[PDB]
Write an enzyme that holds these catalytic residues in place. Structure first.
Site, PDB file in Angstrom:
ATOM      1  N   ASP D  36       1.011  -1.786  -0.012  1.00  0.00           N
ATOM      2  CA  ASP D  36      -0.042  -0.246  -0.237  1.00  0.00           C
ATOM      3  C   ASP D  36       0.690   1.235  -0.119  1.00  0.00           C
ATOM      4  OD1 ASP D  36      -2.819  -1.589   0.378  1.00  0.00           O
ATOM      5  OD2 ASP D  36      -1.637  -1.457   2.231  1.00  0.00           O
ATOM      6  N   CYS D 168      15.364  16.412 -28.998  1.00  0.00           N
ATOM      7  CA  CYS D 168      14.526  16.160 -27.518  1.00  0.00           C
ATOM      8  C   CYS D 168      14.532  18.400 -26.571  1.00  0.00           C
ATOM      9  CB  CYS D 168      15.627  15.760 -26.741  1.00  0.00           C
ATOM     10  SG  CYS D 168      15.804  14.239 -27.102  1.00  0.00           S
TER      11      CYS D 168
HETATM   12  K   LIG Z   1      19.066  11.941 -23.520  1.00  0.00           K
HETATM   13  K   LIG Z   2      -6.027   0.634   2.544  1.00  0.00           K
END
Ligand SMILES: [K+]
Ligand SMILES: [K+]
Ligand SMILES: [Cl-]
Ligand SMILES: [Cl-]
Ligand SMILES: [Cl-]
Ligand SMILES: [Cl-]
Ligand SMILES: [Cl-]
Ligand SMILES: [Cl-]
Ligand SMILES: [K+]
Ligand SMILES: [K+]
Lengths: 362, 362, 363, 363, 362
Positions: D36, D168
């Site tokens: 969790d 990029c």
């Molecule tokens: K990269």
């Molecule tokens: K939970």
């Protein structure tokens, strides 16, 4: 003179008669007043460097200022030559008390943006008493309008509640915080010839009916009107504080429970030279809980004229704290608790809340 | 010689006659001006890295600048070839003095957004003296309008008060902060042929009543006109500073109290070689409180032409501070107090406030 | 012969342009500058300064760090034609980063204004202007042409309008070394465009030889302060080394004249001639006081003046205690001795002379 | 079974044939899914506790998610009883990928407030590929509209550029980041019968032109269109990653360069028992730079079916990281690099990018 | 009395008959109630100093508050003299439960600004049970309006879903969180005579057919409706918690699976004196995962009347945590997990969820 003590118990109780504070009390006043910017009573402004240096938690600052103010009022009584000074410091106390650094926890906790409108009696009770003590010391009417406003708020709120008194946090009722508020009504009455203090009788009746263990002479931790709950534990610091201040309104009340209280919480030791106070029943430990059982009992002992217990408690509290006086100014190297120099100061000069109430003009 | 001293006392007192600062003073001027970005007097900009590197508390920066400024004023008088530099530095002093970093505590404390309009003489007294010293040194009228504005503020506020002078924080009166302000009035008069300085007479009379202990030649810590309180401790640093400044306006005043002051606070030790100053009465401890009693008495000894006490104090103050000169620039490894290199610089060069006031033109 | 902590010989550094190849340690410095994603200083045009944070560069020094890399890069382009494209790329990134507010922001924070190029602040915009020009010189790209012309006009007009020759940094602060960058940027602009902005240089060289220089010691004073007329009374070695190096590119006789006086005043040869240290000011025996950059900038000056013996001596002083190593073909220093350390060592190892940068072939 | 290893190499390569993951791969899925709040695939929300715990730098989170996603896609292919889980996790991966914690570096750098609009193929290339793999695995149309939107952006950008592909950061071109983007186009075509993948031929031609060192079979670090610069250092991790993904689109391409790549970078040691990978040329140091050369070669070895190199690299990578299985969940005490458990997971299950393209349809 | 234990298992199971809590349970109520400002149930303000001192991670505070509350509901049933206090504490629990510090993760995770509107049954399931338990204990209608609103939300959401129940995070289905929600419907029906609990049968059939491993008596970790995925690991803490609460609604259900659960997960050791619980299958390690298997099985053993397992688990859990009672107040030196003093408190007093449903009116 016990080892690690600065003056005798006899010296402290004789200050009023002598019209002069002891040297170490004077050195504490020096700590409070001497050094620029960082002494707690240097400025009216909203600067809290002295409390920063002491690492006072935000929530405790209001009480720190309050107990300083109460000690100052007694100094005014003890030495007429220091009364102008005490009044100046009280003026500063009230100014700082109103800064948001001091009362802000009310807003941060989500309870509202106004700290006086209702329910903050842990705060506004102390503020109302300080308003009053300032005017008794100085005769100044600087805060008279605010004093009146706040006193009406308090009286009205008391009158409207089904229980006798006012809560702190919503649905939290504390007997010690109420005794500040009621005491403040007595002071307003002294100044103005009013009868707000009339509410006191019902309050004294109320707190004796469910909030106290009469046999042990001890108040329960707190009461919670909406559920009717009274927390099952008795509290020494709660009882000591409350009895001290009730003693100024109804001496027979406190004289009735004082020896039972001692029976319940006070442990004398070291062949009678010292004493420790347990915070609650069913334990051998001293000063559990918030750690203020012994200090508040030191103040109660002073209020009750119990010089033997006062001497015993001070012999326990002061020496390990390692007091020293440097350049005529008092320092503790190892304060044993919260509000340490505040409560030790208050107890050393305390003239009785009954005497403060009936303070001479000028 | 002594060990850890940089020049003889005779050498510091001869600087004006020789029209040349000593090498350790030049080395101090190098610290102030040399290294890019981090020297105190690098630019007019609101950058205080020099003070950050020294761990100067925010509230003390205004005093650091002011005392640098007063020392630079004397430098101007000592060496004509350095007068342009001194004037440049004073220009930077004034500019930095006006940065919110420097006066912003006035607003943070809740006293107002404007630092010169009322009260706050601790700040605006120094600023106004600095305006005047800059103009005396340089002949420049760069700040003339601001100078006139602030001088009139101080003049009006003095005229309006029942007590002689002006408060710092609301209801806090300090004799030393006022001495700066009045001296700034004399400087304005010298520059403009005016007579703002006429108020000085009443001021000198006032501070000689309840604010001084005449026999001990010592001023009390402070005055609080609302409550009438005078704080019951006499203060050495307060007295030394005040007498130094007053000596430029009323030399007989200071000449009268100076020997009593010395009696009261100054401890000669090491067979006459050294001296240290108690901050208040009733203690043996030296340099308590803010810790500036010896440093300010050093400046006073210079102002009074007391070469013997100057020498004794410097032998106490300078060697444990471990001075060194690296790359022709002065550093202290262990400054003994706040404002240390500022006050030692100032004392070493100080021509006398009367002399600064009557400074010949450029 | 190779001194005990050195990466390559002085002969090898001075020979780079001849052999059209940078030394292996210069190549490894370029790797440090370019290789690792995100944290290398010349990784992208973005306003990220993690490389400088990893170096603990103080904010006020980042602009200088970027500028001195750029000057080194301009010489790499002149040294090795195969790396000229790379050099131009890094210069592109240098200009972009130079314009980020992290770099020039101190101007606004000190309260001097919200626009860093409008007036004054020559310590910043002089370098920016020179970099605009070196970029176009190296690449032929007109990417920054419009702002290059705009700033050159600003500088030109500011010089015209000032009573003293040149432009201040902080208001009322005049620095001879910062001015030298701005004038050199005017030479580069003229090289690029055939113009004559560099004509103002004569009046400037005359100005600074008056009260700003001690002609006998061959040293400039710290600073000039026009409103008071003050000249700070200390001479400064790093100030002088930097100024003489850049002036040598514009008026080589000026620097020829003062260079041997400068060396006599400031330079300490030691270790039987093997090493040298530079004193920062007069009247002290201590080396590299003040900003701590005297030896580093003299290293640059020695290269510019072709002084291989002094170059060799300073580098033997500077490089070994800094403990250089090459890991994965990339250069690191364990104990950089000063601010701007790898920047100035890089620049000095490749420096072709500011004059030769002016004569850089087109493409 | 070597010491510090969890399963044999034979076991990893047999997973698909046996239709079941090894127990350590199951323990890794447990780490990913079990606890969790802190497991990385616990919630669809913008919580990154798992990555805070591993001290994942902000810029790397996007690659972590993406490499998890690629591994989950192989798990789906290996074991039909885990396909629902795999799909559920891929759902969460896409959802987390779109959180500002993940792409926000693009805005902080000053490159824009919208991370997919233009450029930034490092981010939106992986996102587009994830959209695709999610839908291949689950058949869910949850992200179809977004998937189609991004795919057109990527297609139109390629069509508009002079170079084959997408940058990029502005003016930064990386082959490995482009390879993801192109693979995402193949996945889109497989889902929708389109022909976006047509642009692959031009891209493979371009990257073989100046971006590759033919003899060493290695790509140079990066390309920069404005200056035309190609950084002069070859990168192992760049090559390994690129050859692995290209092998899915054009296996002859990767087959041609793979043995060259291995001679250039791969160091076999411990008598043939281990191997480690150098990051660039002219060094003996293993895993310099970003430190991922070996980890990505492990992935490449898997993609090429090179069981010997896979075993050698894993003998080098896993033992010193101290794997332990506690409560049926995998932890490494000393992960040797960034993206460590992500890349080992992905290499241990990888079915081949070509096999992922040919995934059998969803029910 | 086993070593390291505070009270016998006999003593805990006998509390309701004695109409008194054990002394260590009373010491736990003191920790919760005694010290000003820092005790968790000091005031209904949005202050969480208690949890900051415990280093409770933010996301865990709501379960801390909820499990305290369930504990308090059983105190109210055990000791009539403590029912008013239990009521007061529950009032505070509901109040703090609504503070943004407690539910805020919902918004930060990007799931929305309203924590009860849709989904998030992990939070609003507990809140709704607490509303009802508060009103069962006190009879107060302080929260009745918001109780009705939230009960309807849950009811409508169950009716609208294709699967039986409600998700936590979008697309995350947890059987334990759902069990809290269904139980909250039973509580609402007991207070209002409604039939919201009717939806329970469909829920039980669904979780039994799909989400439980009937042979091992164990629930799988979670379910995911969109993908249809069921996480392939069985979970002890999940199962222990779910069977405990289901036992209050359908005792036969939990009785069916309880012996199988113990077979699968529970390891008895130390000659039958201690037990510890494995979190999942295929391991020997105890208490992995969230680390709560043993603590929730302790609660389950209590609910099922299994004194032997209860004693074994408590012998494992409590002694290494090193309990002590200082000033009548309980502290553990080394809590072995999250939610430690909350879950030991709850297990020690738990009267059974069925018993809570049948609470007498006051
Ligand atoms: K990269
Ligand atoms: K939970
Ligand atoms: Cl103190
Ligand atoms: Cl000296
Ligand atoms: Cl210094
Ligand atoms: Cl470096
Ligand atoms: Cl891991
Ligand atoms: Cl605890
Ligand atoms: K002052
Ligand atoms: K500079």
């Amino acid at each position: 003179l016990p080892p690690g003590r600065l003056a005798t118990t006899e010296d402290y109780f004789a200050q009023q008669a002598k019209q002069a504070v002891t040297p170490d009390v004077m050195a504490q006043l020096a700590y409070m007043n001497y050094i620029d910017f960082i002494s707690p009573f240097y400025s009216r402004g909203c600067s809290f460097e002295a409390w920063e240096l002491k690492h006072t938690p935000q929530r405790v600052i209001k009480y720190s200022i309050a107990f300083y103010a109460y000690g100052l009022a007694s100094v005014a009584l003890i030495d007429p030559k220091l009364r102008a000074l005490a009044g100046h410091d009280l003026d500063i106390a009230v100014s700082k008390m109103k800064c948001k650094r001091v009362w802000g926890d009310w807003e941060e906790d989500g309870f509202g943006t106004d700290p006086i409108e209702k329910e903050n009696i842990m705060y506004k009770g102390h503020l109302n008493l300080m308003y009053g003590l300032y005017q008794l010391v100085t005769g100044s009417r600087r805060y008279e309008a605010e004093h009146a406003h706040l006193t009406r708020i308090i009286h009205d709120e008391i009158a409207a509640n089904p229980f006798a008194g006012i809560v702190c946090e919503p649905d939290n009722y504390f007997v010690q915080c109420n005794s500040v508020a009621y005491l403040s009504l007595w002071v307003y009455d002294r100044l103005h010839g009013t009868d707000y203090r009339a509410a006191t009788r019902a309050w004294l009746d109320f707190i004796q009916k469910d909030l106290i263990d009469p046999e042990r002479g001890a108040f329960y931790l707190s009461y919670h009107p909406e559920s009717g709950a009274v927390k099952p534990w008795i509290s020494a610091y709660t009882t000591a504080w409350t009895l001290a201040m009730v003693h100024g309104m109804d001496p027979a009340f406190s004289e009735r429970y004082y020896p039972r209280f001692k029976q319940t919480f006070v442990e004398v030791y070291d062949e009678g030279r010292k004493a420790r106070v347990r915070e609650t029943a069913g334990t051998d430990d001293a000063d559990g809980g918030v750690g203020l059982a012994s200090a508040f009992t030191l103040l109660l002992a002073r209020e009750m004229g119990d010089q033997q217990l006062f001497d015993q408690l001070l012999n326990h509290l002061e020496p390990p704290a390692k007091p020293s006086i440097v350049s005529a100014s008092l320092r503790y190297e190892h304060p044993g608790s919260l509000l340490f120099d505040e409560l030790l100061f208050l107890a050393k000069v305390h003239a009785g809340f009954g005497a403060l109430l009936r303070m001479p003009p000028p």
